[PDB]
Design a protein around this ligand. Structure first.
Ligand SMILES: CC[C@@]1(c2ccccc2)C2=C(CC(C)(C)CC2=O)Nc2n[nH]cc21
Ligand SMILES: [Ca+2]
Lengths: 340, 17
C-alpha cells in the first residue's frame, strides 16, 4: 500500500511513501502496531483519534529530538466507516531490552555488566532529556527500550502513555506496567511527579542484574507486598510523601532485605548502590536522571578506550546538547570526562 | 479505592509474610 504522509520532523512537508509486508506485531484497544517495509523495515502505530482534539502522542514526539528517543519518520491519517485513525510511522529497531534479556534468561546466562552499563546510561540520559522537555513517559519497562544488537544504541519508544505533568493537575494513578509501577501510584497518588520514571528505570536495572523482575507482583496490592519484602515496610513519613491518606493505618513492620543480599554474588557494589538510590519510597529522594548518569556505576563508559564487548565503539554517550548541559550544570564536570 | 479497604487488604497480605 502507498500513501502521502507528513514528515515527522521539520516543517509540514509531504512525501509519498510506499510500504509492503504489513504484519500485526500487537493488537489492543490502545491501538494496533504493525511492522512493514518501505527498502527499510518500519513500525506503524494505528490509533483511533477524536478529530476534535490533538493526538497527545503525536504532539510529544514532534517536540522531542534526541539520539536516545525513537524517531517519528512520518505520520498520516486514515478513515473507516467521524471515525479517524492516526498512523505513526516510526524508525524500526531490531531488538528490545526485553527480548535481549529473555534470550539471556532462556540460555541461563547473565547479561554482561558492560551492556547493562551502556544500556542503562542511555535510558537515564533519555529520561533526563524528556523530563527537561516537560514529558513524563509513564511506561518505562524493558519492552519499551529499543536496542540495536550491534551498536548497542538504545532508544526509548511508545509514548502512548506519556503526559506533561503540570503542577496541581491530578493524574491517573493506575498507570505504568505493574512490575515497574512506583509505590506512590499503587497508593493511588494523583499528584505524582516524573520521578515515577526513575523508579521504573531502577526496576529495569535491578531486573538486568537479577535475571528476573525485582518486584513481581501479581496484583496491585501484591506489588506493594513484593516491594515491601525487599525495601521493608515504608515508614509513616514515607507514606506521607506518597499518599498522606495512608499515614494513620497500622501497617505490619517487615524488615528490609539487605541490598547486598538481594543480588547475586559478584554483582558490582556500585550497581547495588545505584539501585538503592533509585528505588526509594519517597519520590523526591530518588536520583535525578542526570544524577544517575553521573553515578560511579557508569565510570567505565567515561574511561578513555572503553569498547563494546563485540569490539566496536561505544555508541553516542557524551555528545550533549546545550540544553542537556543546562539541566544540572554542577554534574557537567563528571558527565563530560576530562578527555572531552 | 477506599483507603481503609486497600490498607486492610495490604495489612492482611503483609501479616502473611
Ligand atoms: C514493531 C514495533 C516495535 C515496538 C513497538 C512497541 C514497543 C516496543 C517495540 C517492535 C520491534 C521489534 C520486536 C520487539 C520484535 C517487535 C516490536 O514490537 N522493534 C521496533 N522498532 N520500532 C518499533 C518497534
Ligand atoms: Ca507475591
Amino acid at each position: 500500500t502507498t500513501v502521502v504522509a507528513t514528515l515527522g520532523q521539520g516543517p509540514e512537508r509531504s512525501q509519498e511513501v510506499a510500504y509492503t509486508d504489513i504484519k500485526v506485531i500487537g493488537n489492543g484497544s490502545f491501538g494496533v502496531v504493525y511492522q512493514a517495509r518501505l527498502r527499510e523495515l518500519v513500525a506503524i502505530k494505528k490509533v483511533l483519534q477524536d478529530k476534535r482534539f490533538k493526538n497527545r502522542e503525536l504532539q510529544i514526539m514532534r517536540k522531542l529530538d534526541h539520539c536516545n528517543i525513537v524517531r517519528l519518520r512520518y505520520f498520516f491519517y486514515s478513515s473507516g466507516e467521524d471515525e479517524l485513525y492516526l498512523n505513526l510511522v516510526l524508525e524500526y529497531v531490531p531488538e528490545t531490552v526485553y527480548r535481549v534479556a529473555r534470550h539471556f534468561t532462556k540460555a541461563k546466562l547473565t547479561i554482561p555488566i558492560l551492556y547493562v552499563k551502556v544500556y542503562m546510561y542511555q535510558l537515564f540520559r533519555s529520561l533526563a532529556y524528556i523530563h527537561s522537555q516537560g514529558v513524563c513517559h509513564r511506561d518505562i519497562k524493558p519492552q519499551n527500550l529499543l536496542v540495536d544488537p550491534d551498536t548497542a544504541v538504545l532508544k526509548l519508544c511508545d509514548f502512548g502513555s506519556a503526559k506533561q505533568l503540570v503542577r496541581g493537575e491530578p493524574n491517573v494513578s493506575y498507570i505504568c506496567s505493574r512490575y515497574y509501577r512506583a509505590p506512590e501510584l499503587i497508593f493511588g497518588a494523583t499528584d505524582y511527579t516524573s520521578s515515577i520514571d526513575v523508579w521504573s528505570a531502577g526496576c529495569v536495572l535491578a531486573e538486568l542484574l537479577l535475571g528476573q523482575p525485582i518486584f513481581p507482583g501479581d496484583s496491585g496490592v501484591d506489588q506493594l507486598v513484593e516491594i515491601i519484602k525487599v525495601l521493608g515496610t515504608p515508614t509513616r513519613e514515607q507514606i506521607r510523601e506518597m499518599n498522606p491518606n495512608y499515614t494513620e493505618f497500622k501497617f505490619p513492620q517487615i524488615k528490609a532485605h539487605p541490598w547486598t543480599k538481594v543480588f547475586k554474588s559478584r554483582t558490582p557494589p556500585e550497581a547495588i548502590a545505584l539501585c538503592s538510590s533509585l528505588l526509594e519510597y519517597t519520590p523526591s529522594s530518588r536520583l535525578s536522571p542526570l544524577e544517575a548518569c553521573a553515578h560511579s556505576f557508569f565510570d567505565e563508559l567515561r574511561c578513555l578506550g572503553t569498547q563494546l564487548p563485540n569490539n566496536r565503539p561505544l555508541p553516542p554517550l557524551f555528545n550533549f546538547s546545550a540544553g542537556e548541559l543546562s539541566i544540572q550544570p554542577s554534574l557537567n564536570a563528571i558527565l563530560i570526562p576530562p578527555h572531552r | 479505592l477506599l483507603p481503609q479497604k486497600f490498607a486492610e487488604e495490604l495489612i492482611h497480605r503483609l501479616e502473611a509474610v
